[PDB]
Amino acid sequence: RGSGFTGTLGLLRLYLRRDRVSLPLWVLLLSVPLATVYIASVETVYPDRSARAAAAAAIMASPAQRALYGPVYNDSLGAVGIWKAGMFHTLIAVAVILTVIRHTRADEESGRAELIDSTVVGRYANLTGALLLSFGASIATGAIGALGLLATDVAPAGSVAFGVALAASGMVFTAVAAVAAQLSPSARFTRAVAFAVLGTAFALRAIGDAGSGTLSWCSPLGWSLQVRPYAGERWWVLLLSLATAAVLTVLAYRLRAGRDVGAGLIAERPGAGTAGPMLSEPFGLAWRLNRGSLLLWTVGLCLYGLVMGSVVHGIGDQLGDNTAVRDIVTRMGGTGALEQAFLALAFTMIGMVAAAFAVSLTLRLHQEETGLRAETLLAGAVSRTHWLASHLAMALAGSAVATLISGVAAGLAYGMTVGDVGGKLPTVVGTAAVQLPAVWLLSAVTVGLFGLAPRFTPVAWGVLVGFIALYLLGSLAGFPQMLLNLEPFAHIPRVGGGDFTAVPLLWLLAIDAALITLGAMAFRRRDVRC
Amino acid sequence: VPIEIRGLTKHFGSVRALDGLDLTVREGEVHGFLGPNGAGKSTTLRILLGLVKADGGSVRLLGGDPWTDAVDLHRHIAYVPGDVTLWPSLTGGETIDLLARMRGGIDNARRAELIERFGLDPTKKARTYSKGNRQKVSLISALSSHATLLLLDEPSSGLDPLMENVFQQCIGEARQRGVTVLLSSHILAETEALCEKVTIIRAGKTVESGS
Amino acid sequence: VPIEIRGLTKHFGSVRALDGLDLTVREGEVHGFLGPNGAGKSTTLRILLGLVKADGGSVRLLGGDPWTDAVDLHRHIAYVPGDVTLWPSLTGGETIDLLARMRGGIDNARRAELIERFGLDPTKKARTYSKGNRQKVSLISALSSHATLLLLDEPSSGLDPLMENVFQQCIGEARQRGVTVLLSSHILAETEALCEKVTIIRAGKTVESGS
């Protein structure tokens, strides 16, 4: 009566309950902003075939955009409109990798999948449950994307082709995550392997696209882009991602069938037996705790800034002259030129990303406290402000160095583009470093929360989101100019020419210091509760 | 004979003989399973469940073998882990009732009184539970279930002496409904209070056994 | 008198008197601190450290007061958490010296033999450790550390009887170097083996005390 797949549906329902909020979010948040945000935004920007042909030529005459998103094959509304949704393949890959690793590993690692296994469940119920959940999530987001696209005036066949391409891109990396989850007892190591496979697929696709295009055929990302939705659909390449998914699922089951529940197939690197000369205080400990996140975020922001430096010159010649563009880049973005008034939009979103970086590294403080590891630190000869100065120090310094390296990369790319770097690098570095008063806030906000309302510490994320909303929904619309001052990014001045008053910088720095001081003073007189 | 192992052997790295010539026999009683941490008690409990396969010897769980018949035999069995992280987003009652729609069945009449006298609050999320309250969830889920065999593994870890006494009385009540128990304690006071016919293992072998 | 509390009071939500009229006096000995989980032992240990502030009464830790003098007094003190929680990316050796170096220091001669006889492998990341091996890290870090006062809280949780015996012998060795110990056990066998002059608390008060 019982088989090796018993309890598959019960385990699936457990998984579905356990992420009943995150899954609907990243399914809807990755599928509905296809027709309502991308294609609508190209309709607004390029209303005629003549503009779309110029946009396609621009894209095809720039290695950076053709590498970050791929090529454009014709000037149809659908094709040009969906050329930029092409990062949704990487985003669905990230989502499915995270889901599979969360529900297969990190559930054995915590010992939950031996209490489960000790019930009436088969040997392959956990793997099949997580695989089925991720396949269903990919199919659901693809179907919702196709349903949204079919509510627009684009090619009906291309909508279905892109939806199926997104679903297949999700399924292939569901399979690779299932394979990787059998490889190591550590969930972090399996995530690293899966994301390294995803990153090398992305690199292969990017190198191929900005070139002859041959190498792009060797990456699971790229099989999705070469389906050519709205540009002449090649449906036969979808079964090229079906074979890979089937082979990797078979391999995942084969690896599962020959390993014990506790761990599998790769031992972990031992480490050291003494705590060096640097592990002797909270600063050296939080450096060890944070350096991985600093490296990841800094590399990401440097690569992100390196993208804009090459997409500045070559962003004057090609916009909707006298459209919203050239009338948006001025108001949200500062009036003046069109090259200089665009760095203010690239960096006012490399500052938002750095603000998220800061919020993460400052929420590590709340994680340490609620994880029972702060009462272990503060039961030693560690001051209550010496702790919370390490996490603040690395949060602020990491945000600063990440933003400054982003600015240096963008300035180097921009200078290499237009002749000389010596005249453009200082301006770009100034544009990057002027965002610091507004990225150090949301570190002051999180510290103010942690000390006056520790359980309402994560709401800082919402505040950040709120700011972003108040920056977009409010600055792209006729919202009043009295509640648009409630978020700090609008007040960042522009470096170049004039109109650089440096007063809002001082006000933001004072606000940041006051909030940090309130957080520290209210932590020093507060019960460390767990 | 619910459990009958004699001759069990297993090498993990194939440089770490955890098990060589292990023996155990249980008949409807409470049995104490004593030894240090590296002696192979955890390996024996995970071989009794289908989790790990043995290299040699005979293992006989409730008539069938644990490897092939790991789904049909797990319905008459309850298990308390030596350490489990419980899902942080689920409440205590949700966790208790889920581990029951997977062991197969629960007894609501026993569940209500167990929650009443262990003093658990089955509405807080499992992330907020302390060390003592995390063990109560597993104990209530295992002691209120149709299970002719209980595999406990450090059942009372983090429990104050009052809840220790309540747990001992609950085991005493269960023992006269015909339920066979394995304790595997590490605390010899409760083993002496509850169990008769202990068995002590040193490296892979059983160096002592009896009442 | 390392510890002298009499009159301690604290209401947390004001919905939870966790302390009313608590008493405790220690003089250079091993003291047992007994009571249920909700009786306020955790609150008393967390008030002795600067973590929580009291509403009333006198608390006098090593002469000074735990709240203001929480940095100068913490270097003559070692602490073992009821729930030992560590960092997953660090090995055992780097957590037995990160903890000791942010307290009173580490004695390498004692550390080597403690690692030798608890049978720990200090080249292993802390994520891979079991609960028997997770407790050994805290025990080695606390027992090899200048400390004229040890605040243990369920010190032996997850330890087999052999390591229990080794821990008891280590405490016995420490007791005749002039080190004052608080046990706060929940296991009355080890409390009877080690401690004299226990103190039993029921709700916030001490209902019994003495040898």
UniProtKB/Swiss-Prot annotation, chain A:
GO terms for biological process: response to antibiotic. GO terms for cellular component: plasma membrane. Induction: Transcriptionally regulated by RaaS (Rv1219c). Expression increases in multidrug-resistant clinical strains (MDR-TB) compared to drug-susceptible strains. Its main location: membrane. The chain crosses the membrane at residues 21-41, 81-101, 130-150, 160-180, 192-212, 235-255, 295-315, 341-361, 392-412, 432-452, 459-479, 503-523. The complex is probably composed of two ATP-binding proteins (Rv1218c) and a transmembrane protein (Rv1217c). This is Multidrug efflux system permease protein Rv1217c.
Swiss-Prot record, chains B, C:
It comes from the Bacteria. Disruption phenotype: Inactivation of the gene leads to a 4- to 8-fold decrease in minimal inhibitory concentrations (MICs) for ethidium bromide, novobiocins, biarylpiperazines, bisanilopyrimidines, pyrroles and pyridones. GO terms for molecular function: ATP binding; ATP hydrolysis activity. Its main location: membrane. The keyword Transport applies. It is found in: Cell inner membrane. Belongs to the ABC transporter superfamily. This is Multidrug efflux system ATP-binding protein Rv1218c. Keywords: Antibiotic resistance, ATP-binding, Cell inner membrane, Cell membrane, Membrane, Nucleotide-binding, Translocase, Transport. ATP binds at G35, P36, N37, G38, A39, G40, K41, S42. It is a peripheral membrane protein. Transmembrane segments: none annotated. GO terms for biological process: response to antibiotic. The complex is probably composed of two ATP-binding proteins (Rv1218c) and a transmembrane protein (Rv1217c). It comes from Mycobacterium tuberculosis (strain ATCC 25618 / H37Rv). The keyword Cell membrane applies. Probably part of the ABC transporter complex Rv1217c-Rv1218c involved in the resistance to a wide range of structurally unrelated drugs. Could be involved in the efflux of substrates belonging to the diverse chemical classes of novobiocins, biarylpiperazines, pyridines, bisanilinopyrimidines, pyrroles and, to a smaller extent, pyrazolones. Probably responsible for energy coupling to the transport system. The lineage of its organism: Bacteria, Bacillati, Actinomycetota, Actinomycetes, Mycobacteriales. Disulfide bonds: none annotated. The chain holds residues 8 to 218 of 311 of the full protein. Induction: Transcriptionally regulated by RaaS (Rv1219c). Expression increases in multidrug-resistant clinical strains (MDR-TB) compared to drug-susceptible strains. GO terms for cellular component: plasma membrane. Its EC number is 7.6.2.-. Residues 3-211 form the ABC transporter domain.
